[PDB]
Design an enzyme around this catalytic site. Structure first.
Site, PDB file in Angstrom:
ATOM      1  N   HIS A  88     -11.690   6.590   7.588  1.00 45.41           N
ATOM      2  CA  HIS A  88     -12.162   5.253   7.295  1.00 45.41           C
ATOM      3  C   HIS A  88     -10.957   4.359   7.098  1.00 45.41           C
ATOM      4  O   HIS A  88     -11.003   3.451   6.311  1.00 45.41           O
ATOM      5  CB  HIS A  88     -13.025   5.252   6.022  1.00 45.41           C
ATOM      6  N   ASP A 121     -14.338   5.542  11.657  1.00 43.87           N
ATOM      7  CA  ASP A 121     -15.643   4.988  11.308  1.00 43.87           C
ATOM      8  C   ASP A 121     -15.528   3.534  10.896  1.00 43.87           C
ATOM      9  O   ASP A 121     -14.447   3.080  10.506  1.00 43.87           O
ATOM     10  CB  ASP A 121     -16.249   5.750  10.113  1.00 43.87           C
TER      11      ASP A 121
HETATM   12 MG   LIG Z   1     -19.996   4.352   8.275  1.00 43.57          MG
END
Ligand SMILES: [Mg+2]
Ligand SMILES: [Mg+2]
Lengths: 263, 263
Positions: A214, A19
């Site tokens: 992430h 992401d």
């Molecule tokens: Mg995001």
């Protein structure tokens, strides 16, 4: 059923998904370093145009939470900005004010801009901002229109949807011809337990899983982000030989592959 | 004249101006590190909202040269973008398509947005994209309309202005009430010489000098820019005690001071 038509029925298959690509130089850094195919790019990110890869999608944005860096809309609808002309810092702010037509314009813009930068394969939403029913309808309609596969979870338990949204969400979730994934988010969980989270994936039964990370490189630029400890833990866990071994136990799937099979 | 009415006639006076703040976390870092009041901020920069200091202006942008980070227009005029929706990569690409009305909306937008983040005192243009006569006019009108002093040089020699622009630029450069500075830019000159350039300011007669620097801090994100060697050279020069001492012999002058004197 989807796994069926991909001849992957009964297998444990895993979509590992990076992401927030485009947000910082560190994120792109980790994406380059990690060697894995799948992520989605935030078109308004400063580094959106620095990312290249085989399984890339558009990470739709309608909010900008950090003190810095912050992102601005592509289109000029007023309902989308707050009020230095950045996207709102919270979903609450967004959901209270954004008009649907303004959103749709903005998302169309984001997608078309993306298609000028890599071949997008899929579509998802930062902070599940498309969770307002209203917009969710836009989201799915867009995915179809652009022949991009959208991220649809099998259930929305544990996503903190505001309850008033549930009836209509459940509604079009049930009604969608789109494949659903079994969703997994180690975000929210304490950084030092991240390793163990990834190692425990070894215990999941067969099925089609979607796990989001992430990962960001440990960097001064990266440490300006409040959630950096959790972003780095993702990065180090994923680089850990034990985790790499666990991940190998899944048949790895790209959205590209899934898209071929739906469109 | 202006030196006269500041009560500074006869002195060696320097405006030291930090450019491209808001571009990278490495630039902002250098601004802090250097503790000097004056610079200007690229409002479409991802780090635009991370800077604060007492003499800040808006560094207007109409072009995005690097392959990343790249910047997008705030407004959605078509002549400002290229074809991925970024600012164009060259003055040439820009000047051959930009409409003046659109540029005006855009720079207006960038000015408004800057007001929300700090108290702007001046106005300059990144890569002097306002040199097209046309837009130079726009630019001074706006400096008027928002009570911010514009960057205006004494000579336009060695700024690579397309020759057919010199006449019009000379005309309005001549007719403007606004004060003209003596422009200095060590951008161009080799990184390892830089320290020299700064010391050789010792040899400068009285006058009003504008010295622009692009100091940036040694950083993976910083070094994603192709011109980082020279950015970091500025930083090491200005943080050298010799060079601080030579800069001391000048009467430091903020754009803020200039602004009270003229509005
Ligand atoms: Mg995001
Ligand atoms: Mg500049």
């Amino acid at each position: 059923d989807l796994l069926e038509r991909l001849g992957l029925g009964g297998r444990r298959v895993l979509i590992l998904h990076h992401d927030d690509l485009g947000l910082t130089h560190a994120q792109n850094g980790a994406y380059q370093a990690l060697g894995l195919p799948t992520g989605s790019v935030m078109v308004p990110g400063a580094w959106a145009s620095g990312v290249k890869g085989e399984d890339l999608g558009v990470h739709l944005v309608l909010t900008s939470e950090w003190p810095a860096p912050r992102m601005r809309p592509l289109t000029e609808g007023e309902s989308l900005r707050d009020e230095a002309g950045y996207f709102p810092e919270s979903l609450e702010a967004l959901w209270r004010k954004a008009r649907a037509e303004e959103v749709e314009r903005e998302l169309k813009a984001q997608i078309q801009a993306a298609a000028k930068l890599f071949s997008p394969t899929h579509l998802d939403a930062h902070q599940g901002a498309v969770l307002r029913p209203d917009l969710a309808e836009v989201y799915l309609r867009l995915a179809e229109a652009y022949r991009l596969v959208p991220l649809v979870p099998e259930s929305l338990e544990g996503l903190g949807v505001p309850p008033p949204f549930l009836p209509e969400l459940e509604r079009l979730l049930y009604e969608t011809p789109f494949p659903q994934v079994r969703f997994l988010d180690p975000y929210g969980l304490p950084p030092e337990e991240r390793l163990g989270f990834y190692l425990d994936l070894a215990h999941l039964p067969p099925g089609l899983y979607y796990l989001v990370h992430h990962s960001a490189l440990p960097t001064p630029e990266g440490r300006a982000l409040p959630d950096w400890p959790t972003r780095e833990a993702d990065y180090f866990a994923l680089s850990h030989p034990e985790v790499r071994r666990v991940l190998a136990e899944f048949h790895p799937l790209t959205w590209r592959a899934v898209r071929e099979a739906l469109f």
